[PDB]
Design a protein around this motif. Structure first.
Motif, PDB file in Angstrom:
ATOM      1  N   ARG A  54      43.950  43.272  37.345  1.00  0.00           N
ATOM      2  CA  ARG A  54      42.777  44.272  36.979  1.00  0.00           C
ATOM      3  C   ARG A  54      43.310  45.101  35.887  1.00  0.00           C
ATOM      4  O   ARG A  54      44.146  45.685  36.126  1.00  0.00           O
TER       5      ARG A  54
ATOM      6  N   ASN B  11      41.791  48.208  32.996  1.00  0.00           N
ATOM      7  CA  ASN B  11      40.550  49.023  32.523  1.00  0.00           C
ATOM      8  C   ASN B  11      39.454  49.087  33.366  1.00  0.00           C
ATOM      9  O   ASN B  11      38.066  49.264  32.999  1.00  0.00           O
ATOM     10  N   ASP B  12      39.755  48.733  34.755  1.00  0.00           N
ATOM     11  CA  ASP B  12      38.391  48.980  35.634  1.00  0.00           C
ATOM     12  C   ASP B  12      37.332  48.096  35.368  1.00  0.00           C
ATOM     13  O   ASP B  12      36.280  48.578  35.797  1.00  0.00           O
ATOM     14  N   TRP B  13      37.387  47.076  34.586  1.00  0.00           N
ATOM     15  CA  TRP B  13      36.364  46.417  33.957  1.00  0.00           C
ATOM     16  C   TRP B  13      36.068  45.195  34.725  1.00  0.00           C
ATOM     17  O   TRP B  13      35.182  44.982  35.357  1.00  0.00           O
ATOM     18  N   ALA B  14      36.838  44.166  34.619  1.00  0.00           N
ATOM     19  CA  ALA B  14      37.097  42.951  35.122  1.00  0.00           C
ATOM     20  C   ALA B  14      38.213  42.274  35.605  1.00  0.00           C
ATOM     21  O   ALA B  14      39.301  42.910  35.217  1.00  0.00           O
ATOM     22  N   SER B  15      38.294  41.236  36.451  1.00  0.00           N
ATOM     23  CA  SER B  15      39.490  41.013  37.032  1.00  0.00           C
ATOM     24  C   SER B  15      39.585  39.423  36.754  1.00  0.00           C
ATOM     25  O   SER B  15      38.754  38.862  36.782  1.00  0.00           O
TER      26      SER B  15
ATOM     27  N   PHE C  89      32.600  38.838  37.646  1.00  0.00           N
ATOM     28  CA  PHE C  89      31.510  39.516  36.939  1.00  0.00           C
ATOM     29  C   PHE C  89      30.767  40.363  37.878  1.00  0.00           C
ATOM     30  O   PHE C  89      30.581  40.087  39.330  1.00  0.00           O
ATOM     31  N   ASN C  90      30.239  41.409  37.259  1.00  0.00           N
ATOM     32  CA  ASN C  90      29.178  42.390  38.269  1.00  0.00           C
ATOM     33  C   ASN C  90      30.121  43.016  39.164  1.00  0.00           C
ATOM     34  O   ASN C  90      30.143  42.817  40.535  1.00  0.00           O
ATOM     35  N   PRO C  91      31.092  43.967  38.831  1.00  0.00           N
ATOM     36  CA  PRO C  91      31.801  44.419  39.791  1.00  0.00           C
ATOM     37  C   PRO C  91      31.361  45.677  40.453  1.00  0.00           C
ATOM     38  O   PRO C  91      32.077  46.706  40.656  1.00  0.00           O
ATOM     39  N   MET C  92      29.991  45.779  40.527  1.00  0.00           N
ATOM     40  CA  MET C  92      29.223  46.816  41.137  1.00  0.00           C
ATOM     41  C   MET C  92      28.429  46.231  42.461  1.00  0.00           C
ATOM     42  O   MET C  92      28.173  45.199  42.672  1.00  0.00           O
TER      43      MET C  92
END
Length: 148
Positions: free
Chosen positions: A72, A74-78, A115-118
């Motif tokens: 992981r 930039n806490d964006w995507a993994s 995708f969509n890590p929220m």
């Protein structure tokens, strides 16, 4: 600690063989509190579909075990990559005795993105390719999971 549960469906096509298969996979994830590492283990079960015409029936089953690390940034995507081993078995006819493997096996690998890590919903999409002596198999895997 944090745990994530994901499930997905995949369809496979055999290049050089005439057949199509469908299977499902279940994934378990473990993370470390002070030094997180992304690990996914998946078990896949696929079955061959039968068509009515000739009247002959054949039972074919395939099972595969795989595991992959994940990174992981930039806490964006993994992203993650996996490798595993699969075995397939089919009905047997009485053939004279000779040295050979009772079942067929092959190696599989691929990579996937999250995708969509929220919220409690995230999606996983990956491309899978496997080699089973001289036969090429391609499988696409997509699923959904939740973390708590």
């Amino acid at each position: 600690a944090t745990s994530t549960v994901t499930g997905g469906y995949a369809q496979s096509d055999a290049q050089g063989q005439m057949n199509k298969m469908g299977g499902f996979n279940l994934k378990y994830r473990y993370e470390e509190d002070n030094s997180p590492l992304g690990v996914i283990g998946s078990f896949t079960y696929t079955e061959k579909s039968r068509t009515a015409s000739s009247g002959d029936y054949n039972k074919n089953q395939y099972y595969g075990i795989t595991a992959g690390p994940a990174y992981r940034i930039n806490d964006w995507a993994s992203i993650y990559g996996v490798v595993g081993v699969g075995y397939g078995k089919f009905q047997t006819t009485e053939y004279p005795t000779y040295k050979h493997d009772t079942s067929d096996y092959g190696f599989s690998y691929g990579a996937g993105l999250q995708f969509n890590p929220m919220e409690n919903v995230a999606l996983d999409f990956s491309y899978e390719q496997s080699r089973i002596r001289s036969v090429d198999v391609g499988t696409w895997i997509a699923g959904v999971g939740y973390r708590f």
